[PDB]
Structure 1
Amino acid sequence: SRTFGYTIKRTTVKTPSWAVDMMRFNINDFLPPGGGSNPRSVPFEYYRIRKVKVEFWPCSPITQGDRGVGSSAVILDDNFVTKATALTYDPYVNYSSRHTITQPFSYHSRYFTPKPVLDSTIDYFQPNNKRNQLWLRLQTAGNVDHVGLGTAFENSIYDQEYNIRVTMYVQFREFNLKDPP
């Protein structure tokens, strides 16, 4: 439920090279600190996540050409590729649940479900849309970081400024409020 500026730097190379990026989810950013006997603005003992209606709302006009195509392959098992300002290939082009990345003015969105990362070394995760979703706990500091979607915009001569937006849905349960004197 936030936005941030992610401008892709142009390149002079003639070959249409890609520029992979990264988008790590974080629940702490979707809630500011609290006060008194309630450090968290949303007090709850347990909470779950169903889906996240992600969307990469563009900002360039329709007159700007340099339109390309890509493949926003979903990522969850934690295994991003080495970042490069001008990649000479598209590693996310070969995938089952792929999606054509229409740019620039063309609207594009995705839908999936993220899961927490237990250990940074082994990196575990639960299946998608299932009743066996491992519950979590509320924490303002020691909080993990969920994996987002794998973007891959194609470079061009002109600049590019996007406005990524996410709507992390939450299903809180078993509230725990404190009303001191």
Structure 2
Amino acid sequence: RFRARYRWRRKNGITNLRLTRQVELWVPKDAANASFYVNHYTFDLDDFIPAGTQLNSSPLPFKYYRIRKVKVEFQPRLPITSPFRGYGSTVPILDGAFVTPATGESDPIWDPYINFSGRHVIRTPAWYHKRYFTPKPLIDGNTGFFQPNNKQNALWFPNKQGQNIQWSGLGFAMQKGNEAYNYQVRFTLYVQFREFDLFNN
């Protein structure tokens, strides 16, 4: 009754791991104009797992995977005695279509994520902020479909180490003050793997 779920994890090699990577978020300065810094983050499994050997292509010796949850943690670098407090917005964009502008066009003076249904408020000189959600894989670019949050029906993907697809996550907009502040963004993937394959000579 619960011992059949144990046989399913042993017949197919189901393993929940937790991968963690860090990046630096550099927000530039904006002297008395109240602009925003709109960008985004997608999660590729090649950034969380290093390169393997010639025999074993991946350091995690599994064939299939799916990412259950992502925890995106904006960790401040500045103290709470900063001269300017900002208030941005973080949304999970599962559609793969972001409001991030390309280079050449100016940064907006208004918050584009402020009316979204899943926006949280990032306070942006000195405060921690985490989002914890289910990412959606960027399978197709023509239709851009994703499936609802169903753990039993989530699609499995091959662990390919170099051709690994990216999963659509977060879009943020942070206010810009008179100083260029920093953040240390930490991405934590909660991956579920399947069919352990370890080649040997």
Look up the SS of the partner of 1:150 in the other structure: strand
* Displaced runs of 4 or more, over 3 A: none
Which of 2, 22, 25 pairs up with 1:3? 22
Residue 69 of structure 1: aligned partner:
87
Whether the 8 Å CA contact 1:38–1:178 is kept in 2: the answer is yes
Deviation at 1:85, TM superposition (A): 5.1
Give identity over the alignment, percent.
45
Look up the SS of the partner of 1:151 in the other structure: strand
Separation in 1, partners of 2:192, 2:76:
29
Higher strand proportion? 2
Which of 172, 176, 184 pairs up with 1:163? 184
Which of 48, 69, 76 pairs up with 1:51? 69
Deviation at 1:51, TM superposition (A): 0.7
Whether the 8 Å CA contact 2:112–2:173 is kept in 1: the answer is no
Residue 29 of structure 1: aligned partner:
47
Deviation at 1:90, TM superposition (A): 0.9
Residue identity in the other structure for 2:92 = V
Consecutive unaligned residues in structure 1, runs of 5 or more: none
Residue 95 of structure 1: aligned partner:
116
Q: Cα RMSD between the aligned structures?
A: 1.6
Look up the SS of the partner of 2:52 in the other structure: strand
TM-score normalised to structure 2 length: 0.83
Q: Deviations over 1:105-124 (max 9, x none)?
A: 22111111112111223222
TM-score normalised to structure 1 length: 0.91
Tell which deviates more after alignment, 31-40 or 76-85.
76-85
Residue 127 of structure 1: aligned partner:
148
Deviation at 1:98, TM superposition (A): 1.9
